[PDB]
């Protein structure tokens, strides 16, 4: 995945590089005004503030790639 | 003049409004074209309460010149009313339109 | 889900088709917050794996780069889209549009057919196969 | 007050105003859009006053 790492274009559109084929702002504002007049983190997150009170060294010594099948 | 103006700003120059608010179009529009172009109701809706419109006033136009008849421009007015299914085209967009066409049908059973 | 990488720029995108010169580059063009959109990212992120050797998998949105949503014509929440050698692939699922795909595949293994059938045609400069199940009736 | 226009005043301004796409008539378009969902409201007051059919 080198590409992925680099991040510049030449200011170039996409479809042409690769060879691409197809297959008064104020009043209105005004105006406007006169008009105008999840789940799942609930759940978690009451776990994860839980968390906070670990340690660092327990953080490292975490046992790693346990496989038990 | 509203309702064209807005089409200009797409730019769809083929596409033409004539005066009774029939929407012809010169050519087919290619698949971009086609995307653009895709609208809501309202504009297929708004263009046929405008003809509604003008289906009406039309009829005391002719009647001002005398074509229109105090009795042939009434009986044109029921006509119209009774007729609006068969002359706009509205529930292709909307099919619960269909709750006006059977108003008008009944309607036009008891007169 | 963060197994399979993201495409952050349309040049990221067109670079990506071009350096993978011997197997598929597959991108599911949609965004995070839909419903068909994430269960697409998970099926193809347990696949992967599997077929790291014929075909590579990235993820685009279509919010983060809207370049790309006129000339492919990008509409729903998301379209798996295969690529050869810079050559837009084609494939009949049945379902009446023969341009990408639309519908949630439904089985690991089904999926991975379609992906093997693809290359394999492919590989032969063939611009169309077909789907051996044929969803018109799914989708 | 808002005294109204005679008559003729109106009849000539729309006369002017007359092309659709208009360079100048640009403040009207960002406030022409703006003022977009007043129409359905003067189609209805146009109707419900159509002349009945025994007044010319």
């Given at each position: 995945?080198?590409?992925?790492?680099?991040?510049?274009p030449l200011?170039?559109?996409?479809?042409?590089?690769?060879?691409?084929?197809g297959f008064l702002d104020?009043?209105?504002?005004?105006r406007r005004?006169?008009?105008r007049?999840?789940?799942?983190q609930q759940?978690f997150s009451?776990?994860?503030?839980k968390?906070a009170?670990v340690?660092?060294?327990e953080?490292?010594?975490i046992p790693?790639?346990?496989?038990?099948? | 003049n509203?309702?064209?103006?807005l089409?200009?700003?797409k730019?769809?120059?083929?596409?033409?409004?004539?005066?009774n608010?029939?929407?012809?179009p010169?050519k087919?529009?290619?698949?971009?074209?086609r995307?653009?172009?895709?609208?809501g109701?309202?504009?297929?809706?708004c263009?046929?309460?405008?003809?509604?419109?003008?289906?009406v006033?039309?009829?005391?136009?002719?009647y001002?010149?005398?074509?229109?008849?105090?009795?042939?421009?009434a009986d044109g007015?029921?006509?119209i009313?009774?007729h609006?299914?068969q002359?706009?085209?509205?529930?292709?967009?909307?099919?619960?339109?269909?709750?006006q066409?059977?108003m008008?049908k009944d309607?036009?059973?008891l007169? | 889900?963060y197994?399979?990488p993201?495409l952050?720029?349309?040049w990221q995108?067109d670079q990506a088709?071009?350096?993978?010169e011997d197997?598929?580059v597959?991108?599911?063009?949609?965004?995070?917050?839909d419903?068909?959109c994430m269960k697409?990212?998970?099926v193809?992120?347990?696949?992967?794996?599997k077929?790291?050797?014929f075909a590579?998998?990235?993820?685009?949105?279509?919010?983060?780069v809207?370049?790309?949503?006129?000339?492919?014509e990008?509409?729903?929440?998301c379209?798996?889209?295969?690529?050869?050698?810079?050559?837009?692939?084609m494939?009949?699922?049945?379902?009446?549009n023969?341009?990408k795909?639309n519908?949630?595949?439904?089985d690991?293994?089904?999926?991975?057919?379609i992906?093997?059938?693809?290359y394999?045609?492919?590989?032969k400069?063939?611009?169309?196969?077909?789907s051996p199940?044929?969803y018109?009736?799914?989708? | 007050?808002?005294?109204?226009?005679?008559?003729?005043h109106?009849?000539?301004?729309?006369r002017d105003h007359?092309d659709?796409?208009?360079?100048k008539?640009?403040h009207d378009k960002?406030?022409?859009?703006?003022?977009?969902?007043y129409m359905?409201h003067?189609?209805?007051?146009?109707?419900?006053?159509?002349?009945?059919?025994?007044?010319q």
């Amino acid at each position: 995945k080198p590409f992925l790492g680099m991040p510049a274009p030449l200011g170039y559109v996409p479809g042409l590089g690769r060879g691409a084929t197809g297959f008064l702002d104020k009043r209105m504002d005004e105006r406007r005004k006169e008009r105008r007049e999840p789940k799942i983190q609930q759940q978690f997150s009451d776990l994860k503030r839980k968390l906070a009170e670990v340690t660092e060294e327990e953080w490292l010594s975490i046992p790693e790639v346990g496989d038990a099948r | 003049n509203m309702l064209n103006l807005l089409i200009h700003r797409k730019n769809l120059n083929y596409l033409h409004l004539d005066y009774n608010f029939n929407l012809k179009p010169v050519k087919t529009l290619t698949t971009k074209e086609r995307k653009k172009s895709r609208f809501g109701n309202a504009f297929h809706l708004c263009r046929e309460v405008l003809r509604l419109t003008k289906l009406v006033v039309d009829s005391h136009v002719q009647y001002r010149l005398g074509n229109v008849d105090a009795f042939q421009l009434a009986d044109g007015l029921q006509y119209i009313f009774a007729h609006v299914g068969q002359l706009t085209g509205m529930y292709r967009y909307k099919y619960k339109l269909m709750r006006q066409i059977r108003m008008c049908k009944d309607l036009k059973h008891l007169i | 889900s963060y197994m399979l990488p993201h495409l952050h720029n349309g040049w990221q995108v067109d670079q990506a088709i071009l350096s993978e010169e011997d197997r598929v580059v597959v991108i599911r063009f949609g965004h995070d917050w839909d419903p068909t959109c994430m269960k697409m990212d998970e099926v193809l992120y347990s696949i992967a794996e599997k077929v790291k050797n014929f075909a590579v998998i990235y993820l685009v949105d279509i919010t983060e780069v809207p370049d790309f949503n006129k000339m492919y014509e990008l509409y729903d929440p998301c379209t798996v889209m295969f690529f050869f050698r810079n050559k837009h692939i084609m494939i009949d699922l049945g379902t009446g549009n023969n341009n990408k795909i639309n519908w949630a595949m439904e089985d690991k293994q089904e999926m991975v057919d379609i992906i093997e059938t693809v290359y394999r045609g492919a590989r032969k400069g063939r611009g169309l196969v077909v789907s051996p199940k044929d969803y018109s009736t799914k989708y | 007050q808002k005294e109204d226009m005679p008559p003729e005043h109106v009849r000539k301004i729309i006369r002017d105003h007359g092309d659709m796409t208009n360079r100048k008539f640009r403040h009207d378009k960002r406030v022409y859009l703006g003022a977009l969902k007043y129409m359905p409201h003067a189609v209805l007051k146009l109707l419900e006053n159509m002349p009945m059919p025994w007044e010319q």
